[PDB]
Symmetry: C5
Subunit: 336 residues, 5 copies
């Protein structure tokens, strides 16, 4: 009974040329692609790359595979995949990709009577996602994914999505979990590119990422805020206690400096100012400014003490007000 | 004499199609799976992955392999494994897996007269274990492991455990050793999933992990506790010694800040508060609060010394009591 | 209809020796090469290596592949690439190179009636780029790329660029993006090398890199500048406040020392002075010099206070002027 | 003349089944194993793994390979290794192993007239060595190495060492060099294991490692010892110099804290106390205790100075004696 | 015309046994080896390994390959390399080696009428170079490289260099560039080794490395020298300024301690004293000694001020002289 299928499989391979695409010199082959994202890999800001695992599926029509039998479908494995012609799809922006072989090469091959062929593949892609870290950490990123033919121009093989955008790409609820990003949604598109060899069709999918804040607040913002408050305490002290107020000014300035170095260790070495950098500079100014006020006061404490006392008392309320006002502008500007 | 076995092996391969599962178009194939964990690999909290080494064994029934001879069993090696049909089992959550080839590919193939087939394989799996580090370090994790068919729907191939749960999965006494976790036990389960291609059966195994405390106590908790005690010593000093008490307040505050940065270097960059973070914040408040008390006292030491002395003496007993009370609540809450 | 192409392909392979180059013992084979750089990889100063991804294309003429048919071109895939003779091109300076295999080996093979053959390949090259970091960070680098034949001397196979330099090598607008470099332009050249085995032709392409400044300014220059300003404040203080001015001198000197160690952590361990190193040394001298001035003043404050006051007041204006003058010379010299 | 050997080699392969072990269904095969360690790889305490390079050799007897000719031995290469039956030996505790292929696969195959077969292989093994770091750094480790059959039970294939223990395993004089360990000696043993599939024979080799001290003395012990001495100097100072003695106490306590964090960075994250940890805690107590003594003295310096002076002078001799006494007990206990 | 070569190639392969060395059972095969080093890889002191890239060439004589034709030479590629017998050369000390495959496996095969065969190969070798870091950083290293046969004893295959030593090994002018080493020269040698399997010939090449100083001077020596000078300034201060001189002593001692920890982070964890370590210890003594002098002076400043002043003034000139004298001895001893 099983032998009936064996004859059908043998017959199809007879007189079959895997080096020739279906409908060669007759028409234009059409391929339908669908994707399912099992998990979104970590995003490496330093290397401008992001990993992703998907189940890429390609469908096309081949008349040479027509057959008749009791079953309309022939589930199979990767053994027969290399015995026929399959598209040479590749990812243009994929720096490094690898497949999964254990326990068995994760591939499927299904054939219908009319000639429809289904070929699903599991892949891990490490693509490149350029970013503009000008509004860091309040930044939105659009990481793309591009794939297409490598040797068949648009006049021979054309890639088109199947059904609507929602069904075209699917992301698992638990897979879309990142430590410092949110996956708002996905979009798809198509475009043509002109190259030296000819014209080719390109399928593009974009992912929208919204960075989540809260890790940097505990890491960088809060230490800066508390350090500024620490310096202001020196004003409430007495002028004659030169040594006491000296410690406050010196220690606070050095504390801000080390935070600036430590903060950018994880951040990519971008050669331009970021929003976080300006916040540190403003905080550095307040602590540095407080030290200057003490030095100026101590320089004139012997000639005109009347004005010196006013400056010492005035700075108590002036500095906190300015620091509070700056924070409202800073957070509001980047959160709106 | 040995030639008798050679003929039997040759006969089975004759007229055998490795591309067709046993009982195709006749019934539903049944597969029994058992696992043995030789060693549980390190758990990477940063990457949310854990490594594991296992001896995966699959058993099924094939009528085409029936044979008769003096021996009821035919021990073999990986050479004959690729000459017949084997299931395309894969791990759904396996990011990266590799096999062992030295000295020889670690695989076995045994055949019985009735047609029973045994196929054991050795694998190293690097799966993903999402975690909710809200009660860190007093947290319990449930790392799963999923595997199933890739091309055969539930209507063709079904996976079921053999015997009870205890025999289904076994973990070595010495293998289940981790630097920062305890392996309390294991559990198994089964479920069905509906996908675009059809319905498939999924076999799931869960591991219960209980993080062991003691490394963080020496690393983070104790330095914070001692630092708080250090600040309280400043109260016993005299008010006029402004410079002396200034050093205590300034140094202690900076000491807590550096610990907060260092502590989270190893921890994953989670964008939410943890139990350990609150403990540091409370400790930071005490040291910061002590500095404020000294500044307030020194500001009124010239007008109303009577109340200033009471505050200085009152803070000696008040602060230790509150700090001790907080610890009992903190540890009791997360240890019950 | 499709069978016509099948016969043509079979005919060419008949009586074809892939071990013999076209025109063996008759003339000298000529090969034309073109390159397209999709993305320029990160430059590792520590390892003196840079990664690059390209689409290498080679063209040559073979009379044995002449054919006649309705189509003048025969698009194909990597399947037929190994059935014929292809050049053994290799990169002389390539420490480690790998190809891309997913989804399919990214290769193309096209044949014309006259015998022209096109063979494009996708590669990732990790070459070596020696650098002279004497004017760091104001330095320009010239990273080369060399390739040629490995077994065919110049008398047999010759490599020559096609068309002008602009068409020979192309770099993508978005691909040429680096965190700490600018890609000004590219150049090409040819040369001959004499070796033990004979004479060979070498094709060389040079890339001009202009390091972008701005990351080191925030990282190293600014902390040094502010630290110097901090020390100068000690002059405005009073001499009798020995402890107060002592803190300024001690803290500033240590601050510069740690920056020197931290700054060179990322930089390669070059055993010679750099421009940045001299800047730190000059800044270290000012802070160290200020401490010496205070010690000298305090040593003679009991014998001849008249001259001590003049030095204290004189240093207020003298030091800032010298520091400002030095910066203009330093920046102008390396920016012109 | 050479053709005589060619016929012999062809004859043996004729009618040879590589899937059947020698003496199948007749007797029990016996295998002799010998090892030579060229170099002992670094021991990773963090990952509890150690690398090793060996020349594994296996010998067995096969009657089917009997031959007659002028030469009693037939040196060969890896080409003929896969044409016959070889044992499926594997390492039970080997997490990851790889072979050497350049210039040629490092394997040998020799055959004698009686049927004796020699098969040597070169391997690199990354095994796991669990450790009990309770007496760290004065700890002794016993890293094992296990190998055996994967599919042939004890009733078919048995592994036994050849000759005495000394000849069984050999370690190169220069290979046994480690940065933080000493290789005292080696031992061998045999045991049987009962599993689900049956009974198997296991060959075990143990290596005795004696950690060498001297790196931690310069790294951790000495800084702690000097820091304790630094605090004692504060006693010789005068009580009225509150600020001076305050600096000694504050700085010393923080210095010990940072050493504790830095010291354990390299050490594995073991969740239990070690001998080194207790030493730091004792040193921390002395420096912390000294600060308490000063605070207590300064609190009563106004009421009863008579007793305050005695405590200040008494602590000068008391503290050094206790610290010296503790060291003798600590070192003697762990060095005996 | 080309067909003439095809027949010659086919004829040689006919009746050719790749499993038998030329002149088997007749004489002893002789092999000539030459090497060319394109680039010397980085030397990893921590792992005691060094990478190297070479073009290894082997030559031998085979009578079975004699042929007659118009051309005396037959350039070829790697395709025919595996069709004949080649030596199983391997590197004894090579921990891990890999070849280059892109664009084509970098191998050559040339044959002459007399039977001379040339076989060149490109390899990357990561060998092991044990070092004795007793005079670090003024140390000279001799990194060897060993290769030989794996299965052919000395009685069958013998390796000998060709021509003089200079032609035997060649190093590129630009390739021999290291960040912290100088390649003075190279040497070659031969030796025999007796093993269990028999006697084998070993070819050895030694490289002489001279570490370049200048990176450690900026990194470790200079900070130590300046720190010592800083402590001496405290002597010029007045005794009554107890707090001022206290800061100098405390800060300097801690500064030296951190440098010792940081300095050895890059250095391998060698368990013995190095020359650099002694320099730090001597520098630590001076700064520590200065603090003791101040404490002793302050202890007797009330009883016998006459002697206290002499010590304070005496130490001003005594300490600089001793420090300068020590440097001359230290540098002269290790630089001669
Ligand atoms: C389709 C195809 C395949 C191979 C080749 C090719 N093969 O040898 C050479 C030389 C080329 C030139 N070449 N390569 C690539 C290329 N891409 C890269 C591109 C821009 C960046 C995003 C992705 O899309 C357009 C354009 C081009 O002109 N040309 N087009
Ligand atoms: C069984 C199977 C095999 C292949 C495919 C398939 N092959 O090409 C496409 C496109 C798909 C779509 N697809 N892929 C995967 C999938 N899994 C992943 C899942 C959720 C997360 C945990 C593991 O289980 C359910 C559902 C689905 O619908 N579909 N089901
Ligand atoms: C073309 C070729 C191919 C193989 C060989 C060869 N094969 O076995 C040996 C031994 C050699 C010697 N050898 N190797 C290499 C070589 N290059 C490297 C070089 C200098 C640095 C930049 C790149 O170009 C010149 C010169 C030389 O003389 N000789 N030339
Ligand atoms: C010999 C062999 C080979 C394969 C298998 C096997 N193959 O599929 C399953 C399932 C098993 C079960 N299994 N696996 C391994 C095993 N070892 C591991 C062990 C303990 C730790 C040290 C090393 O030795 C004993 C026992 C056992 O019962 N059983 N024994
Ligand atoms: C030539 C060869 C090849 C294989 C074998 C061999 N194959 O199975 C076993 C077991 C051995 C034993 N063995 N292995 C190696 C060996 N070397 C390593 C050595 C010392 C260190 C520097 C490099 O040279 C001498 C000596 C020895 O006795 N014996 N010699
Ligand atoms: C790409 O080419 C096809 C040819 O049929 C055309 O229909 C389509 O509009 C083109 N796409 C773009 C974006 O120009
Ligand atoms: C899965 O499908 C099988 C079909 O026989 C059914 O028996 C089983 O109950 C299903 N499992 C679940 C969880 O629905
Ligand atoms: C290389 O050799 C060719 C031989 O035709 C010659 O034409 C060319 O000028 C040579 N190039 C150089 C740089 O000498
Ligand atoms: C293992 O089994 C063999 C069977 O012959 C027996 O001789 C040997 O004593 C057994 N070893 C142990 C440790 O029980
Ligand atoms: C090695 O053996 C050969 C045998 O001919 C001998 O000539 C040579 O001197 C030996 N080398 C050494 C170092 O003993």
């Amino acid at each position: 009974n099983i032998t009936i299928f064996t004859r059908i499989l043998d017959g199809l391979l007879d007189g079959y040329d895997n080096r020739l695409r279906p409908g060669l010199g007759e028409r234009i082959t059409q391929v339908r692609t669908d994707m399912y994202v099992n998990s979104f890999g970590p995003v490496s800001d330093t290397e401008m790359e992001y990993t992703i695992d998907i189940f890429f599926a390609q469908t096309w029509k081949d008349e040479r595979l027509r057959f008749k039998g009791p079953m309309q479908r022939l589930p199979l494995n990767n053994l027969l995949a290399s015995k026929i012609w399959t598209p040479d799809t590749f990812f243009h922006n994929g720096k490094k990709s690898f497949a999964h072989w254990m326990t068995t090469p994760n591939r499927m091959l299904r054939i219908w009577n009319d000639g429809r062929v289904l070929y699903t593949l599991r892949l891990t892609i490490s693509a490149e996602c350029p970013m503009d870290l000008e509004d860091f950490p309040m930044d939105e990123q659009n990481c793309p994914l591009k794939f297409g033919s490598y040797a068949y121009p648009n006049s021979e093989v054309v890639y088109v999505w199947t059904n609507g955008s929602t069904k075209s790409v699917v992301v698992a609820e638990d897979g879309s979990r990142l430590n410092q990003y949110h996956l708002m949604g996905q979009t798809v598109g198509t475009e043509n590119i002109s190259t030296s060899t000819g014209e080719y069709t390109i399928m593009t999918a974009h992912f929208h990422l919204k960075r989540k804040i809260g890790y940097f607040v505990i890491q960088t913002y809060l230490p800066c805020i508390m350090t500024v408050i620490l310096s202001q305490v020196s004003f409430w002290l007495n002028r004659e206690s030169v040594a006491a107020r000296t410690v406050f000014g010196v220690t606070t300035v050095l504390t801000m400096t080390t935070l600036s170095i430590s903060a950018r260790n994880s951040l990519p070495k971008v050669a331009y100012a970021t929003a976080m950098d300006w916040f540190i500079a403003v905080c550095y100014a307040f602590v540095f400014s407080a030290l200057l006020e003490f030095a100026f006061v101590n320089y004139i404490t012997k000639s005109q003490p009347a004005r010196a006392a006013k400056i010492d008392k005035m700075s108590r309320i002036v500095f906190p007000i300015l620091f509070g006002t700056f924070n409202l502008v800073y957070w509001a500007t980047y959160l709106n």
